[PDB]
Write a protein that binds this ligand. Structure first.
Ligand SMILES: C[n+]1cn([C@@H]2O[C@H](COP(=O)(O)OP(=O)(O)OP(=O)(O)O)[C@@H](O)[C@H]2O)c2nc(N)[nH]c(=O)c21
Ligand SMILES: C[S@@+](CC[C@H](N)C(=O)[O-])C[C@H]1O[C@@H](n2cnc3c(N)ncnc32)[C@H](O)[C@@H]1O
Ligand SMILES: [Mg+2]
Length: 259
């Protein structure tokens, strides 16, 4: 059993007041006061981020940890925060974004955020059974939290396998994907296998809540995976009992228009 497995048990052992205080302590949070109401009322002319996902991917790129270029696929696009982010980047030529939609799942938000015309959104699509196609950059932000760590491990394993399938079609593709439960040993095994064939490493973004162990794998970086995970587990355990609140920052505004 791993340090992260213990963290998950400690998390589930929090009382409600402990949990809600722990969840946001010391994390960056975008200010979505305006963006949320614009989306609620159905405004389509807006470039404020359609979700909290945009600033996460932006941070990864600003840090130099991802390469976003060429023909991009967004697997599990949800509202589309990553799709709109990618579409606004000059090195990106097109975005093919796929998400399952349906009951209890986010459908793509339709806005004029810069480069929207270069995105082909397709909802009602299961990416786990969809045959891969050519792409220069493969993104996947899939991984639904579960109180059950074994379920999170299995959901993570399916994402890593999907990425192996997209790399089999596109061996030279840039990859960035969510690893929901990197602390699970079955996930560590799959990541080692991925890293030994494709390179890459794991990083934590500062916008992820403390209630999730999610980390992001990118082929553009390197680093011992076990060490990366254990450093993050300790950080998450050390924040229990922290009284600092979240740190509020402006939300990404990409502007509007076609490219
Ligand atoms: C609501 N809640 C969640 N957790 C734990 O925190 C993890 C994440 O729970 P979460 O509520 O922070 O994320 P969610 O599952 O809603 O996904 P989101 O839509 O992206 O926000 C869960 O899998 C549980 O392990 C919780 N743990 C405790 N102790 N008490 C709680 O009320 C509680
Ligand atoms: C957390 S969202 C990604 C957030 C996104 N990156 C953003 O910035 O808004 C992950 C999405 O993947 C979708 N999803 C989960 N399983 C899927 C599947 N098998 N096929 C397609 N989409 C799936 C979920 O509905 C969810 O909306
Ligand atoms: Mg919740």
């Amino acid at each position: 059993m791993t340090l992260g497995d213990l963290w998950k048990r400690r998390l589930n052992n929090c009382t409600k007041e402990e949990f809600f205080a722990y969840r946001r302590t010391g994390i960056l949070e975008t200010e979505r006061d305006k963006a949320r109401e614009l989306l609620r009322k159905g405004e389509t002319n807006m470039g404020l981020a359609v979700s909290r996902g945009t600033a996460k991917l932006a941070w990864l790129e600003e840090r130099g940890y991802v390469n976003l270029k060429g023909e991009v696929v967004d697997l599990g696009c949800g509202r589309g925060g990553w799709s709109y982010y990618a579409a606004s980047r000059p090195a990106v030529m097109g975005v093919k974004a796929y998400t399952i939609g349906g009951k209890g799942h986010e459908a793509p938000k339709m806005v004029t955020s810069l480069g929207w015309n270069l995105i082909k959104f397709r909802a009602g699509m299961d990416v786990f059974t969809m045959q891969p196609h050519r792409a220069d950059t493969v993104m996947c932000d899939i991984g639904e939290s579960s109180p059950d760590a074994a379920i999170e491990g299995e959901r993570t394993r399916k994402v890593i396998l999907l990425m192996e399938q997209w790399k089999n079609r596109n061996p030279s593709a840039s990859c960035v994907f969510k690893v929901l439960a990197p602390y699970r040993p079955e996930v560590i095994e799959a990541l080692h296998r991925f890293q030994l064939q494709w390179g890459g490493g794991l990083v934590r973004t500062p916008f992820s809540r403390n209630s999730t162990h999610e980390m992001y794998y990118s082929t553009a970086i390197s680093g011992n995976i076990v060490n990366s995970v254990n450093v993050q587990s300790r950080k998450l355990l050390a924040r229990f009992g922290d009284q600092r609140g979240p740190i509020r920052v402006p939300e990404m505004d990409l502007g509007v228009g076609t490219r």
